Swiss-Prot record, chains B, C:
Exists either covalently attached to another protein, or free (unanchored). When covalently bound, it is conjugated to target proteins via an isopeptide bond either as a monomer (monoubiquitin), a polymer linked via different Lys residues of the ubiquitin (polyubiquitin chains) or a linear polymer linked via the initiator Met of the ubiquitin (linear polyubiquitin chains). This is Ubiquitin. It comes from Homo sapiens. Changing residue 65 to A: Prevents phosphorylation in case of mitophagy. Decreased localization of PRKN to mitochondria. Phosphorylated at Ser-65 by PINK1 during mitophagy. Phosphorylated ubiquitin specifically binds and activates parkin (PRKN), triggering mitophagy. Phosphorylation does not affect E1-mediated E2 charging of ubiquitin but affects discharging of E2 enzymes to form polyubiquitin chains. It also affects deubiquitination by deubiquitinase enzymes such as USP30. Mono-ADP-ribosylated at the C-terminus by PARP9, a component of the PPAR9-DTX3L complex. ADP-ribosylation requires processing by E1 and E2 enzymes and prevents ubiquitin conjugation to substrates such as histones. The record marks 68 as: Essential for function. The chain holds residues 1 to 76 of 685 of the full protein. It comes from the Eukaryota. Residues 1-76 form the Ubiquitin-like domain. Changing residue 74 to K: No effect on ADP-ribosylation. Changing residue 72 to A: Impairs ubiquitination by CRL2(KLHDC3) E3 ligase complex. Impairs ubiquitination by CRL2(KLHDC3) E3 ligase complex. It is a peripheral membrane protein. Changing residue 68 to A: Decreases affinity for UBE2R2 in ECS(FEM1C)-UBE2R2 complex. Impairs ubiquitination by CRL2(KLHDC3) E3 ligase complex. Impairs ubiquitination by CRL2(KLHDC3) E3 ligase complex.
Amino acid sequence: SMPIILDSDVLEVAEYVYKTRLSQPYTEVGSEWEYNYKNPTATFAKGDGHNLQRYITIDGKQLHRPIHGLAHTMRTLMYSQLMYCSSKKQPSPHVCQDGRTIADLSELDLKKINIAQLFFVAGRESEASYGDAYHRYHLYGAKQFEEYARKHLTHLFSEEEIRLYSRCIEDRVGDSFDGTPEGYIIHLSHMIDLMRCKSPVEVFLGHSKGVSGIVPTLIHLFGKQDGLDIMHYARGLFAATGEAVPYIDSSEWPHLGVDLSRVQRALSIVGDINVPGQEADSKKTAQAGFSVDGCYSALTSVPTPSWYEKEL
Amino acid sequence: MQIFVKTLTGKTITLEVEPSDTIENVKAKIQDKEGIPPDQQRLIFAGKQLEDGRTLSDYNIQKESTLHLVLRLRGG
Amino acid sequence: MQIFVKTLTGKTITLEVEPSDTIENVKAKIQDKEGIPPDQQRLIFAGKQLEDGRTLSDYNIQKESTLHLVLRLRGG
């Protein structure tokens, strides 16, 4: 198969995003950001999570925002490149609300998408993910993208395109994920990476009634083979970047406090499945977290699925 | 009553708890047993991330239920 | 003549080259097969980094030699 490669202009934008945002400490933190649903208007916070996972220490140095840092962000770019290939192989790819599919995107569109994805979680000021915090943080990332685009990317994006990609990053309450293939592929890429920080319920069963799991979603879009290959590829990127790689164990699914109908559905789609976990690794975590050189070296080390190709 | 807490890689402990115990108290029990600061503990049950101020019984957590703990890096 | 390259994913590929090809020409042939821009390429032979305006013959690279491709660093 061919390798998944990011454009060099994209890697320059990743450096700016890292230096100005992803390397920076979260600011919506401390005693003023604690929360209790019983006394909810007590502090600046409107929900839980502001003080969660703010940083981790590796050899005496702090790696800020490790759940939403450089390695997270760059992995998402690899996934969009991969799904672009899978969509072009599909007999009947997914038709977004504009009538367009991922298979209708050009190589230039993927470049643009990749740039936008670098800013998708860059506006976060904590791990808070309740609605108000989530939406404010996506608004901030959208504005950081627009400011940088006007300063350096107007040879690539028109003003109309800057506003289109900014609206994708903003992920508005009232917008669907599949309004356009540009926005859909951004959401799908983010979705795949959630395996780093979600239990088996969200990954395979769907987080609530009426929601498909992460992996079922990939199987519905790309077929069972390619959907499972995407999952395993993401796992590979996890190991290369020192993430904890989750175990998979479908025999445990009925014992996790969820309704039996959600478990039957997941087994009929995915099948029985068992895959070992792997512990996090501090040295790889640091290598991938502290520099685009480090991060891209790790990511490009991982073999791609056998079917991955790109027109050159 | 006993519950299970498993990391995403499958490392397992039990805790001795009561239905009314807050999530904040469960995290202090985890810190006591395993040395993990409460602010490194992201806990999940039945697909939902747990809030400090709510109780095990608020989430329908019962005897021999399993919670998942998303730990990024042991010793980090 | 044929030489081999170990790529970033660890896969082996073959190139068709002449002794008089430049290192720049070599990186172009790798781009044509694998889609890796010349900018991102650092090529290593016998533990030495290979420089763009030298030739294979300048390094005594003969038939069936293997080159190692690594990522050219940007310092950030």
